[PDB]
């Protein structure tokens, strides 16, 4: 006979003890552990609600990978790359470049917790979390690897995080702040709770729904399988949050969640926003970016936040307004500076698409539509010099993304600046400025790509010089319009 897990599970997490040959603080130093002075005894009530055991883990994950790889193998000849819309291929390039090695970075966040969390249950679930992020990183290298021979841009599935390309810097700045650069309890709260029960669902399930509409079942099956792991190890954050609230640390827990959510929002607005409203072919848009946001972040994540005993963030109404506006301007920037991307942005402004954008965001044509009109006329007149930039955009000192606002009829743009220790910083939002002020030593001597440009670190100090600095190795890898402006035939 076998004995049921409920009967022996407690022994697997009976692993705390009172150190005698070193101090408790030497064994769990605050800068790595983040226990906020809560003594060891209090961490033993931590109870992970989504349990697993080593025998079940290796058996179930063997079945998950067998499914993912069997589907990839059976569809190798489905002509997805050849028959897909170029904007869909661009979505794959940006996803794999932005995610794959960041997943491998998440191994280090989970490892931080496996060594330095004072909660024995957390250290075991973080060990499975380490394994899950290994899976995620290896899958999302293995899958795009077969396209290297079609397109040098898929090399950026591996190369992006090794580059100084501006969007790789934005992703690394975020993940190094939330995942690899903070103590174990911060990781539990900012990564597993805030990011992996919130925005990760936009990218791995919202995009899966678009992939299924587009007919890419290898990709949809892949990223939805990845999300099943996230659903288990993301449950490490809830009990840590509850522990901090019950030990007098509600304010600190709220601040970390507030910070983490906003940082993820700005990055996912530039990566997922353009994908869902512009790169994905119209007929394959299952919902708009805003409708997905209201499903996954407002309807699901924010409600779960309240259920755990936390409050709506202080920036709630700022966040709702950003949802209507930010990614439209991020899209325009990524497109206008497409030569700095490792994918080929789709402009996505044929009349058919402009009608859909107007229905999903009333007033779109009077705002971003005004810029796309000038761009469209220049393409129709063969003034291609007017649709490529000769300067760089100003970049947020927090998100590492260009400083944007609403263009056109009711133009409004605000930079939120900050003098700090003899340096002038510029931020794209109130909240980004606030995030900086919560932890200046984390950020104050970092230099964004434009800071480096003006400091002489980018030679020659030209757009061409920035492209060499960003790591581009051939003309083919620089981004171009996804359709080679064939959409202008529709205008």
């Amino acid at each position: 006979a076998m004995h049921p897990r409920k009967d022996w599970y407690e022994l697997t997490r009976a692993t705390n003890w009172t150190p005698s040959y070193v101090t408790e603080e030497q064994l769990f130093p605050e800068r790595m552990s983040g226990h906020m002075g809560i003594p060891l005894e209090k961490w033993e009530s931590y109870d992970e609600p989504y349990k697993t055991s080593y025998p079940e883990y290796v058996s179930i994950q063997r079945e998950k990978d067998a499914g993912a790889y069997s589907v990839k193998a059976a569809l190798e000849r489905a002509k997805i790359y050849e028959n897909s819309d170029p904007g869909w291929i661009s979505t794959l390039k940006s996803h794999y470049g932005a995610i794959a090695v960041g997943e491998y970075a998440a191994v280090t966040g989970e490892g931080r917790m496996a060594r330095f969390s004072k909660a024995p249950g957390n250290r075991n679930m973080a060990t499975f979390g380490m394994m899950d992020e290994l899976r995620h990183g290896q899958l999302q290298l293995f899958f795009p690897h077969e396209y290297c021979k079609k397109d040098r841009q898929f090399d950026w599935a591996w190369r992006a995080y090794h580059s100084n390309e501006w969007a790789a810097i934005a992703a690394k700045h975020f993940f190094d702040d939330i995942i690899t650069g903070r103590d174990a309890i911060s990781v539990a709260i900012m990564l597993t709770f805030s990011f992996e029960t919130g925005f990760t669902n936009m990218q791995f399930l919202g995009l899966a729904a678009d992939a299924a509409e587009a007919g890419d079942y290898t990709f949809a099956n892949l990223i939805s399988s990845i999300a099943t792991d996230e659903s288990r190890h993301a449950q490490q954050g809830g009990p840590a949050l509850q522990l901090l609230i019950e030990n007098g640390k509600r304010e600190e827990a709220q601040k970390k969640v507030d910070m983490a959510i906003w940082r993820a929002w700005r990055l996912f607005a530039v990566l997922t926003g353009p994908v869902m409203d512009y790169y994905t072919p119209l007929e394959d848009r299952s919902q708009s970016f805003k409708e997905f946001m209201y499903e996954w972040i407002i309807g699901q994540f924010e409600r779960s936040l309240i259920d755990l005993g936390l409050d709506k963030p202080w920036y709630w109404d700022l966040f709702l307004k950003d949802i209507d506006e930010l990614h439209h301007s991020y899209h325009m920037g990524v497109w206008y500076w497409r030569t700095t991307a490792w994918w080929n942005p789709a402009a996505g402004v044929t009349p058919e698409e402009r009608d859909w954008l107007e229905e999903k965001y009333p007033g779109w044509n009077k705002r971003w539509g005004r810029c796309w009109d000038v761009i469209t006329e220049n393409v129709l007149d063969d003034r291609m010099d007017l649709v490529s930039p000769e300067t760089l955009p100003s970049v947020c000192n927090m998100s590492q993304i260009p400083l944007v606002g609403v263009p056109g009829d009711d133009w409004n743009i605000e930079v939120f600046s900050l003098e700090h220790n003899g340096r002038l910083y510029h931020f794209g939002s109130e909240v980004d400025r606030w995030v900086f002020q919560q932890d200046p030593v984390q950020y104050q001597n970092h230099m964004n790509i434009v800071d480096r440009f003006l400091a002489g670190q980018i030679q020659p100090m030209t757009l061409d010089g920035a492209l060499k600095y960003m790591g581009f190795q051939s003309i083919e890898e620089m981004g171009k319009d996804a359709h080679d402006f064939a959409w202008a035939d529709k205008c």
Binding site: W368, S394, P402
Partner: protein
């Protein structure tokens, strides 16, 4: 000599790096910013282009130079119309 500013042009969608010179008049600054905006993402229009410190109410005199202005390198300016 070189004098970098961050400039937001009326009706554009973003703030850009524009390097002007320490002795450029405000009229010369506005034209150097307009090179990166008008007929690219912003329609041309009639009227006089004015320069101001970002979000403020007062406009710099058109004849004033960057050196005579109060501006520091990398500060944010708006280029707007009357």
């Amino acid at each position: 000599s070189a004098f970098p500013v961050h400039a937001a042009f009326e009706k554009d969608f973003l703030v850009q790096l524009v390097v002007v010179d320490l002795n450029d008049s405000m009229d010369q600054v506005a034209e150097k910013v307009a090179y990166h905006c008008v007929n690219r993402r912003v329609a041309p229009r009639e009227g006089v282009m004015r320069v101001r410190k970002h979000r403020s109410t007062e406009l710099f005199p058109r004849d004033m130079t960057i050196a005579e202005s109060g501006l520091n390198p990398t500060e944010v300016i708006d280029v707007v119309f009357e």
